Design an enzyme around this catalytic site. Structure first.
Site, PDB file in Angstrom:
ATOM      1  N   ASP A   1      77.970  23.406  72.480  1.00  0.00           N
ATOM      2  CA  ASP A   1      78.495  24.452  71.616  1.00  0.00           C
ATOM      3  C   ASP A   1      78.078  25.832  72.128  1.00  0.00           C
ATOM      4  OD1 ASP A   1      79.399  22.321  69.927  1.00  0.00           O
ATOM      5  OD2 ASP A   1      77.511  22.374  68.821  1.00  0.00           O
TER       6      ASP A   1
ATOM      7  N   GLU B   1      87.784  23.220  64.129  1.00  0.00           N
ATOM      8  CA  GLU B   1      86.500  23.933  64.094  1.00  0.00           C
ATOM      9  C   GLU B   1      86.373  24.909  65.277  1.00  0.00           C
ATOM     10  OE1 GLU B   1      83.979  20.123  64.809  1.00  0.00           O
ATOM     11  OE2 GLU B   1      82.612  21.838  64.977  1.00  0.00           O
TER      12      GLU B   1
END
Ligand code: NA
Ligand code: NA
Length: 330
Positions: free
Chosen positions: A18, A229
């Protein structure tokens, strides 16, 4: 030793995911999740992602030596947090650095908090409560050219965004996925202008519209294109680029608009599917080149929850289109 020349893992001593990349003090600082092999049950609500701290990384060049600055924030020191330190982001304002992070509170509800430092590498002191009116996951705090800062956020399925349609949490027995109305418009990511002190929202949270090329909303059933997301904002030629993960279809895609709030028109794919289920990225300009930071599960031999971050060059065309990256071609 220098790293990031042929899409190799940027670090191997820890698992990383991420990647949110920023240029602070003329260096690239990266704010990733620190994956650990917690051995928790694997499921579609993401319990196997059981991260507990953040390490900030930095590079002076790409390729370059990657510095691991150690633990910048530990879940044990965040008074409001119960579990799961998911993808963070950082911002710089007036010589302070702000780390924004999603975690589940003691009622097992994802909220977004802030932690503050005098250095981009941390360590960061968390506020004792999360941001009022925050919910769900994956903050991206974007500094616009006019000096205004906006938080983009949200994630469906385990990120719980689907449980927030009324501004109050729908409960743990509510939808595990989305609105469950595939012919209705899909759920959109969230945005709020940040307060001057960077600790709160300056307005009621807004939802972003994403439409197709004909101007019609992307539908709930259109999993190739609908928001899942990992919202990210960057600008090119004065145009605003909302990029994001599509989750169960494993793409990073992008959509363009003329202001922070959108609407954004779906354009195409940024990054095709990687090794491992998740796909999560950031897009940053450094020394006049654009870079896509992303991850995969290559280092762990394909374990979805044990990832490694990577980087590659990203090519905008002058008309604002972006060339799709396929991770394993060259
Ligand atoms: Na992000
Ligand atoms: Na394309």
């Amino acid at each position: 030793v220098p790293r990031g020349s042929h899409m190799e893992p940027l670090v191997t001593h820890i698992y990383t995911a991420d990647p949110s990349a920023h240029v602070f003090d003329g260096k690239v600082y990266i704010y990733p999740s620190h994956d650990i092999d917690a051995g928790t049950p694997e499921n579609d609500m993401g319990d196997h992602f059981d991260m507990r701290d953040y390490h900030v990384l930095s590079m002076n060049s790409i390729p370059g030596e990657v510095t691991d600055h150690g633990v910048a924030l530990d879940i044990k020191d965040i008074p409001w947090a119960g579990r799961q330190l998911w993808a963070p982001d950082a911002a710089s304002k007036d010589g302070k650095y702000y780390l924004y992070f999603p975690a589940k509170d003691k009622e097992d509800i994802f909220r977004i908090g802030v932690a503050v430092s005098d250095s981009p590498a941390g360590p960061f002191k968390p506020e004792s409560e999360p941001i009022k009116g925050s919910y769900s996951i994956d903050p991206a705090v974007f500094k616009d050219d006019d000096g205004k800062y906006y938080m983009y956020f949200g994630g469906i399925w385990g990120g719980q965004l689907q449980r927030w349609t009324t501004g109050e949490y729908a409960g743990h027995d509510a939808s595990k996925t989305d609105l469950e109305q595939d012919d209705a418009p899909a759920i959109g990511p969230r945005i709020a202008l940040m307060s001057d002190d960077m600790l709160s929202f300056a307005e009621p949270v807004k939802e972003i519209s994403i439409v197709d090329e004909q101007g019609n909303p992307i539908l709930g059933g259109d999993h190739d294109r609908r928001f899942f997301e990992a919202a990210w904002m960057h600008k090119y030629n004065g145009t605003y680029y909302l990029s994001y993960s599509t989750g169960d279809t494993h793409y990073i895609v992008y959509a363009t608009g003329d202001n922070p709030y959108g609407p954004f028109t779906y354009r195409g794919v940024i990054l095709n599917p990687v090794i491992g289920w998740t796909n999560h990225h950031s897009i940053v300009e450094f020394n006049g080149k654009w870079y896509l930071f992303y991850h995969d599960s290559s280092l762990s031999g394909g374990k979805t929850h044990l990832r490694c971050i990577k980087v590659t060059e990203l090519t905008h065309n002058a008309d604002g289109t972006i060339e799709t990256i396929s991770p394993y071609i060259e």
